[PDB]
């Protein structure tokens, strides 16, 4: 007899398809995640005490002493138990914030400001989201981020140095990095970083492969404060997709006839056509020069959960992203996949072709088929948004269940406490001794900046402070530093867009923001940019934006980008079981190779 | 020994969770889909001929004769085979468009206009997406829409009468429905519809339950051109969520202190806060009074695949939705889940509470937990968008594989050809004899209106034409009438939003578009509106927008909203297997009852 | 009692040996294959054109212009589809050779 | 819903394909093999003894007495146990060869020759290879060869008669069978065989179907010493594929142009093009007239395992196969599938088309596809060689585990001992009484031939000897007679080639070896030969070659050919599960019917 | 004329060649290929005979 397949009922075929995808996901196997050893390494310095100090772990919200170390180690140990269980009552049983006033019920803060506002505590943000399963993609716990840099490492000295330089450069305009007015500060930044071992010496044979891949070399004006994804170091700083508008309704080609929209100029003035309405690319403007958490007492109340959310002030109006601070503001409130949805919308309105290895992409006289639900605009619009929560579950597992890395504000608090005490002949937080010894010039600049901030805040004669100035009043979100929610969603989302569109398409005209007015001008850049490169640049924009705000380190961002790429690849592989058609997605990965799915 | 369950590895628990959800979906069972019987009922009227005419079936793209009937029945029978097969080569072998010129290779059209433009053909949009499986939700084929109205039915005469009245009323302003200057037309519309059996007589015991559910009664100024979802018929015609902006960045409560955004007024000028940038509610303005496909030759060219997409003219600028035509323009280009994502963003910025039966919703002093990834803003933002393509797969199965119902333009074609022939004492398309007999007054107004259009278009002395005027140059999309892509996505998306938010929350101040100016005014409505009621209204606004453009009937829209609700409910049920927490979604259904999931 | 294994018929032992070897091969797992990225990197140099050139890809057999670049990108895209499908009729529908 | 298949991962599909082939092989079921009863039938003739004699079983290597019967029956019974177990130690524990000298450790032989050479013992050659499984094809034990002829049967009298006639005809030239010089011997052979019941009387109703199929009728010059596969009895004795060379490099057709190789004449001088080098068809030349094991003492040392391998002498040079002895030499050293690989190579070089029911066999302008890996030269070259070890495992099971039939040399030893003793008024080996009684004329010829051989060997006055003269010094290989390794590989290999090529192609020019020179001449044969017939002839050449050497009987060969055919058919059926293409192999079987696989 | 750099793909490091000489000109890198004569004994010698 002649060998055959057999049919079954549609219901059974749907069931078997879903089981086959689960089985594909299972057969990938799993890998363990490894932490850096700090959690139990560092100890309480008190004689007659057998406790870890937990100073290099995320403890925001747990009650801290006057130096920013936690008071009761059981408070952190209980927090870890609650993270791994997820039980609601166990979370409600934890200790949050400082001691309370018997009569009002209010938390007693250290600062005059927090007390005058009568601030309450804010809580941890999905501390057990790493336990949730999902109907599609790699399980949250099946994949890994490598060990975070340690406080004593050359890597961390370079990372925190970079963040202080960003904080002090917040009022610099992107289009003015090369201007004589900025020459003194910019060159100080470049010289300071090139003075650090991480940047001035290469990796050694036998170093961890992950460290080798993320290590950076010579700092230039062309790479200052940039990422390392391919495309990011080429051309102007900001991706086209965060400043330009799009083609508008009424511009169209109908047979041999060209129609021009009456609103065509909106394209070059920051308006994305959004169906039949618009999106404006102009960001709200945070008070220039105003930074937060530069006073130790305010800083400590924040570390004890004082809810400063919403305390910022703003100038009237809006403007295309202009300064380093404006990018921090952009990533303060963005709605999840916002940046990538907006890039997707620009790409559709401008008629950039989809990946040519999908079906039905030919002229319709040839294939008799147009695209929408599958292989078209609706398909890409669902996929770019859907991968986001899957990427987030994975990064929550790393954040809370594995690494619990302290945010940069807390590293600056150790540095400041360490430096102040050393000046009076004492040692506190010897773990950051290298940073204090090496970053002398930068910290003196921070000290001067912070004195000015504390005076404007109402303190005529402030204690010296070497704290890292924050763009936001509340500083970091209420969850650990490693990895990043913003950068994981960025990795996932741009992976989808590179794969779905013909990502090799070249950009025709390159723009940047004008030096003198709030408008777009033609860039003088002479090379060629591609859609894929500008998508990568966009991912690196949103991710470094968090760093410029003072809430992530370089390593958090890069390693999260790679994690999100893995989640998105996995979802595409599982979904491929559901189509009858003959096709694949061509994906140029962050490492410069291509996978066909 | 004491009864127990046991642990297994994380990877196996994930696999088992996915199979369990596939099993829950399989255990729902499946139901068949029944068509109305027209496809093989209507016959070619020539004697010595043995073919179905297919005149009540979607045939856009197949070659038509001078009356709008397909020339070769095998062209349709082959289209049906390719739909059920999905094979790309079988699709490319279909006949699309008219005869081509041997030397240029271009289609030869009937109209001077299509030939001067040298138009090519456009093709069917995912004619086999109904075969596609999905990793979550009900399979596309497991659910059904009921049989569509037939051409000889009171329901159909009512439906097509309404669409003409919408087309002739496209320049009527919403804020002026009840106003003296529109009294004559508005009362003509109301009297005409109340003169039809479907509206002036109730259903009879023994009629299909789906007919009883969707039949409408007495037409009034308060229900004219509205939907029937609970909430749609109270208060102003347009949902608050398609005309109002939102609270802006800088308005906040920080402890005992209230801060005010410098841009607070943007809320009442239709700017939605979109992260740190904005969306504007102002729509593009299509040239008032210009309709399309009012000439028989141009109409036939469109039925033969002539690609007129992009041919509309616009005025400068943008305005809040003012006329019926403006709603048509809104739904011509909207990106998928656009209306519902924008409502979601307004609800988030204004701080409307999440469903209180979710976890972690209490003040953090009580529960020690805030929300984002699960049960917060990122969760709802991903959920509202991801349901869209699963709903689109199900409606594609109903569109192409089951019902293949002709679009309203094609019904209009049959009415026009029948009336013109009857004046010469000839009978063509007797199937629409009843609409032709009962809609005399409406059809005389259409003929005058069509003459004025054909004169504008450059015809010095137009033949008489009773065609349904189209808001769009290309008419309907390239896929069947029943059901609707817009309405199915609306049903699914508003289902997610009502379940995730505390949808019982009452709206504070109710707005409307001003009679004199491009701005909002406070409405005189006294009564209370709820979030759930305004979300339903929003779904009805987008769905009836399609009707006002001339591209769907009433029954397409209502039956599609029911189907999209089913899809969203199923996705929520299967996903509930993925969480450790104790919680549910409370969802007020379209039928007035509540399911807890 | 003393632990033991047991005999079965020769035919079943042969069947089981073959499945066991299939299982050993399945339990090795699989790895993906990564290409160098050229195929969609290099573009047609004409302005107002939106195609990959495919110049670094094997195109022997598809029609070439006077410089050795393929004339019609759809000829290559169809070749790639037929490769992944294997269907004999799809292969016979490709364009092979000049006019 | 519409009935469907579903996809799974490539890995699972490969696994399921391999399991499905195993299941196909299992569902064939199995059959038992039946032996002829001799093993326990014949008894020791000693009074006061209850032992089988095992005289009709293979016992080569076990110590024999002066009449060639085994000394200790436990030695054979242990050998049988070792065969069915395969355990290495159990095999090492067996008794091999005669008694040994306490000082040197050397075996003490009967003959002066074996002692002067200091010969050691040789061992059994894979006595348990019938226990090994395989990843593809029918299991070794699932199939059967029927009972071997018994010593008392008319069949065996005819078989051993034939072998003595071959041995005495070793210096006859194939091209001279019909010559007056050879008339006396050739006619003696034909008359002697036609005098035997097997050949002169047909089978009877009720005889075993296997016997009916292999029974031979009237002996003629045209069928003398030939096989019975279809094609073998037509045209010259030797297959074209064992004498002709092939088309050579540089002979080619390029469009409308014919190129001629400078080496074109090599074709007709026995050179097969072997890639870019050559194979010569000229065989080494064994000393004409020199035969072995014609002295009882030498014969007995061989039966006791005396390793005479490599003792032959040769004339210098090489020549196309010329005499019956040259064919014996050919099959003394051939490398497994050698003959069939060489035929395959001739067929490829000469451009014989593949089976037209495979894919892609049309002109490339029609199918856009050439062949190599699948359905081409590489495919056939792997398949023709791969089936050989699978065929061998099956024949080892029959040889060792089932039948243990004695080789022809041992039958001649019984005949000689029987005849010598009868002349002195005694009875030994009454089992061969019929052979001795009937073969009088042939044995007297053997006696004269053997006297001459023993004189040339250095014995001036030799004892009379009626032994069967051997072509090889060692006689048979160290494994039983039924079936044959050579003939099973032949059956398997030519089955592959008939199926893979268009086996109905007719041969254009027929050649044979020249009567007077070492060269090829055109045959005067007037009919038509096909590729399939000449492939069958080749199988029968190699198989009868073993008989001409003195090491197999007719029945061994034919029944092994049928066994190999079954193994090759089974492998093709299991492999057919692995292809996506639509095709089959057309196979003309040995029985004259065709199977499509 | 230059070695691989730390961080290059491992497959590149494995296959990169160094200084070209008369002894390695046009040869492979499998162990054994770069010692003795260019052609393998097995493509030029015959064998022991019958
Ligand atoms: Ca197309
Ligand atoms: Ca809470
Ligand atoms: Ca071919």
């Amino acid at each position: 007899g002649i060998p055959a397949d057999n049919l079954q009922s549609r219901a059974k075929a749907s069931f078997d398809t879903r089981v086959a995808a689960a089985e594909l996901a299972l057969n990938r196997g799993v890998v363990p995640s490894f932490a850096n050893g700090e959690e139990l390494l560092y100890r309480n310095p008190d004689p007659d005490n057998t406790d870890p100090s937990f100073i290099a772990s995320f403890t925001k919200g747990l009650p801290h002493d006057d130096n920013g170390a936690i008071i009761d180690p059981d408070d952190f140990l209980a927090f870890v138990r609650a993270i791994n269980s997820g039980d609601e009552k166990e979370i409600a049983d934890l200790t949050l914030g400082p001691a309370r006033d018997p009569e009002t019920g209010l938390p007693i803060w250290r600062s005059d400001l927090a007390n005058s506002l009568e601030l309450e505590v804010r809580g941890w943000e999905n501390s057990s989201a790493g336990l949730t399963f999902d109907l599609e993609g790699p399980d949250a716990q099946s994949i890994a981020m490598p060990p975070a840099p340690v406080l004593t490492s050359p890597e961390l000295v370079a990372e925190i140095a970079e963040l202080y330089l960003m904080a002090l450069g917040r009022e610099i305009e992107f289009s003015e990095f090369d201007s004589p007015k900025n020459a003194e500060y910019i060159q100080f930044a470049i010289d300071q970083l090139n003075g650090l071992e991480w940047f001035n010496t290469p990796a050694k044979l036998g170093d961890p492969p992950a460290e080798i891949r993320r290590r950076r070399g010579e700092v230039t004006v062309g790479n200052l404060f940039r990422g390392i994804l391919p495309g990011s170091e080429v051309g102007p700083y900001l991706s086209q997709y965060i400043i330009v508008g799009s083609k508008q309704i009424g511009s169209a080609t109908v047979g041999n006839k060209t129609l021009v929209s009456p609103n065509a100029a909106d394209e070059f003035d920051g308006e994305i056509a959004y169906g039949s309405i618009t999106i404006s690319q102009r960001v709200r403007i945070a008070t220039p020069g105003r930074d937060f958490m530069t006073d130790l007492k305010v800083f400590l109340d924040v570390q004890d959960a004082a809810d400063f959310r919403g305390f910022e002030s703003y100038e009237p109006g809006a403007r295309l992203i202009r300064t380093i601070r404006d990018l921090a503001t952009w990533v303060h409130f963005d709605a999840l996949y916002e940046a990538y949805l907006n890039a997707c919308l620009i790409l559709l309105a401008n008629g950039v072709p989809f990946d040519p290895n999908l079906p039905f992409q030919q002229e319709d006289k040839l294939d008799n088929q147009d695209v929408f639900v599958n292989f078209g605009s609706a398909h890409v619009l669902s996929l770019v948004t859907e991968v986001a929560t899957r990427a987030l579950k994975a990064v929550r597992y790393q954040k809370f269940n594995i690494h619990r890395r302290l945010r940069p504000e807390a590293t600056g608090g150790l540095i400041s406490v360490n430096k102040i005490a050393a000046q009076k002949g004492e040692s506190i937080f010897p773990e950051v001794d290298l940073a204090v010894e090496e970053l002398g010039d930068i910290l003196e600049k921070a000290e001067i900046s912070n004195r000015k901030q504390n005076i404007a805040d109402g303190d005529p004669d402030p204690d010296p402070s070497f704290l890292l100035p924050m763009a936001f009043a509340e500083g970091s979100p209420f969850h650990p530093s490693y990895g990043s929610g913003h950068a994981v969603v960025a990795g996932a989302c741009v992976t989808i867009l590179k794969a779905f569109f013909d990502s090799g398409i070249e950009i025709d005209q390159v723009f940047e923001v004008d030096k003198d007015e709030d408008k777009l001008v033609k860039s003088s850049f002479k090379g060629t940019l591609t859609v894929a490169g500008e998508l990568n640049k966009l991912a690196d924009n949103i991710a470094i934006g968090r760093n410029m705000a003072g809430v992530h380190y370089f390593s958090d961002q890069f390693e999260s980008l790679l994690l999100g790429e893995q989640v998105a690849i996995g979802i595409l592989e599982e979904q491929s079981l559901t189509y009858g058609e003959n096709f694949f997605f061509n994906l140029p990965k962050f490492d410069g190779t291509t996978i066909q799915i």
Side-chain angles (χ1 to χ4, degrees), chain A residues 301-459:
Chain A
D301 297 329
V302 167
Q303 302 312 294
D304 294 338
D307 190 354
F308 273 94
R309 282 173 306 171
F311 194 63
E312 292 85 12
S313 65
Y314 301 85
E315 298 316 324
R319 62 178 193 204
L320 304 165
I321 294 165
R322 203 170 185 83
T323 52
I324 285 178
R325 185 170 320 259
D326 292 338
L327 190 53
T329 298
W330 207 100
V331 307
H332 198 189
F333 297 115
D334 63 310
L336 193 48
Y337 46 61
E338 174 166 359
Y340 330 102
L341 173 57
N342 292 176
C344 188
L345 288 164
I346 296 176
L347 295 171
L348 300 160
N350 297 354
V352 181
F354 299 122
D355 183 326
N357 301 288
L358 298 181
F360 306 142
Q361 305 303 321
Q362 287 171 278
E363 254 199 301
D364 285 3
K365 69 158 148 160
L366 298 177
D367 62 20
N368 296 337
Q369 197 89 175
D370 202 357
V371 293
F372 182 69
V373 182
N374 295 334
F375 328 120
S377 68
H379 198 177
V380 67
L381 284 161
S382 263
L383 220 28
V384 74
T385 60
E386 100 179 55
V387 293
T389 45
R390 284 90 189 168
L392 284 169
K393 291 170 196 195
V395 97
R396 280 301 208 268
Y397 180 68
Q398 298 291 320
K399 270 169 175 297
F400 280 104
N401 304 90
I402 310 300
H403 299 276
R404 303 174 287 270
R405 190 205 187 160
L406 84 172
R407 296 271 191 159
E409 66 202 51
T411 294
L414 304 181
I415 278 167
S416 182
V417 173
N418 174 306
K419 188 171 164 85
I420 285 166
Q423 280 178 351
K424 328 161 135 84
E426 292 178 12
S427 179
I428 299 174
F429 306 135
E431 293 89 349
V432 304
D433 275 351
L434 189 64
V436 171
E437 200 272 308
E438 286 178 348
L439 303 187
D441 292 357
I442 294 168
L443 298 173
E444 298 299 337
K445 253 146 186 171
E447 186 192 16
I448 290 143
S449 180
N450 286 338
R451 165 174 188 85
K452 277 192 193 110
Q453 190 63 62
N454 294 327
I455 289 183
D457 284 338
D459 203 286

Side-chain angles (χ1 to χ4, degrees), chain A residues 24 27 46 67 102 107 115 146 157 182 224 239 261 282 298 322 374 411 416 425 437 469 482 521 533 543 551 558-559:
Chain A
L24 191 155
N27 292 340
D46 292 6
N67 301 139
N115 282 315
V157 182
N182 285 321
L224 181 70
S239 165
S261 177
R282 290 187 154 81
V298 180
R322 203 170 185 83
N374 295 334
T411 294
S416 182
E437 200 272 308
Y482 184 88
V521 293
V551 310
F558 180 68
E559 298 288 349

Side-chain angles (χ1 to χ4, degrees), chain A residues 215-245:
Chain A
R215 192 152 175 168
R216 282 175 290 162
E218 254 255 332
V219 180
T220 64
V221 56
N223 73 22
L224 181 70
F225 302 158
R226 297 206 181 203
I228 57 173
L229 301 172
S232 289
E233 284 173 48
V234 179
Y237 188 100
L238 287 174
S239 165
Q240 297 301 294
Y241 305 123
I242 209 182
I243 55 157
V244 310

Side-chain angles (χ1 to χ4, degrees), chain A residues 114-134:
Chain A
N115 282 315
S116 77
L117 295 162
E118 300 177 293
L119 302 179
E120 255 301 344
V121 299
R122 61 181 299 196
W124 300 287
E125 299 171 271
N126 300 117
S127 36
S128 288
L131 306 175
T132 316
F133 303 107
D134 205 275

Side-chain angles (χ1 to χ4, degrees), chain A residues 473-542:
Chain A
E474 81 276 13
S476 83
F478 239 66
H479 49 89
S481 201
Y482 184 88
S484 166
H486 279 78
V488 88
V489 165
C493 291
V494 306
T495 292
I496 295 299
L497 306 170
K498 292 190 295 187
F500 205 107
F501 285 88
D502 184 352
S503 63
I505 291 277
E506 292 170 347
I507 275 100
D508 216 313
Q509 179 82 258
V510 180
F511 298 99
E512 38 189 293
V513 176
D514 187 77
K515 282 177 224 188
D516 296 321
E517 282 154 50
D518 180 34
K519 77 195 182 167
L520 295 171
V521 293
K522 287 157 208 194
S523 164
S524 77
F525 165 73
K526 302 263 181 284
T528 285
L529 304 178
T530 62
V531 167
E534 286 300 288
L535 289 172
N536 283 355
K537 191 179 268 163
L538 185 62
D540 264 331
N541 290 159
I542 271 63

Side-chain angles (χ1 to χ4, degrees), chain A residues 90-313:
Chain A
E90 197 175 332
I91 297 147
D93 288 341
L94 260 6
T95 293
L96 185 58
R100 286 162 182 277
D101 191 303
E103 342 259 21
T104 59
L106 286 160
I108 300 170
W109 304 110
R110 274 168 177 121
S111 76
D112 277 357
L113 181 52
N115 282 315
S116 77
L117 295 162
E118 300 177 293
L119 302 179
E120 255 301 344
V121 299
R122 61 181 299 196
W124 300 287
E125 299 171 271
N126 300 117
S127 36
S128 288
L131 306 175
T132 316
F133 303 107
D134 205 275
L135 293 185
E136 69 172 12
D139 177 69
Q141 305 180 7
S142 69
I143 52 182
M145 277 170 77
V150 303
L151 291 177
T152 49
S153 63
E155 189 166 15
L156 185 273
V157 182
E159 291 187 331
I160 198 70
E162 180 170 48
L163 302 175
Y164 272 103
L165 292 171
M166 293 170 160
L168 301 167
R170 273 174 195 146
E171 265 58 63
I172 296 169
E173 293 182 13
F174 291 110
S175 72
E176 270 178 346
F177 270 34
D178 249 316
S179 96
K181 175 173 114 240
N182 285 321
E184 204 239 85
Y185 186 77
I186 288 285
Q187 202 51 55
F188 171 83
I190 297 161
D191 296 350
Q192 282 302 122
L193 293 167
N194 282 324
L196 300 182
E197 171 181 352
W198 185 245
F199 290 106
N200 73 32
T201 306
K204 282 204 275 88
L205 185 62
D207 285 350
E211 253 184 43
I212 296 173
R213 178 177 181 184
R214 68 176 187 250
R215 192 152 175 168
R216 282 175 290 162
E218 254 255 332
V219 180
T220 64
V221 56
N223 73 22
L224 181 70
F225 302 158
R226 297 206 181 203
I228 57 173
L229 301 172
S232 289
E233 284 173 48
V234 179
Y237 188 100
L238 287 174
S239 165
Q240 297 301 294
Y241 305 123
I242 209 182
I243 55 157
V244 310
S246 80
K247 179 158 132 160
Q248 305 286 320
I249 298 303
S251 281
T253 296
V254 189
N256 60 22
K257 171 175 265 258
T258 303
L259 300 67
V260 180
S261 177
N263 310 293
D266 296 354
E267 181 161 2
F268 307 108
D269 193 44
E271 311 294 311
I272 305 168
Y274 178 30
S276 298
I277 66 183
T278 55
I279 287 156
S280 168
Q281 295 269 40
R282 290 187 154 81
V283 65
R284 293 314 186 178
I285 306 165
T287 301
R290 174 182 193 202
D291 298 302
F292 302 88
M293 291 164 61
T294 55
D295 171 75
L296 187 66
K297 287 192 238 277
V298 180
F299 164 87
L300 293 159
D301 297 329
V302 167
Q303 302 312 294
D304 294 338
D307 190 354
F308 273 94
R309 282 173 306 171
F311 194 63
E312 292 85 12
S313 65

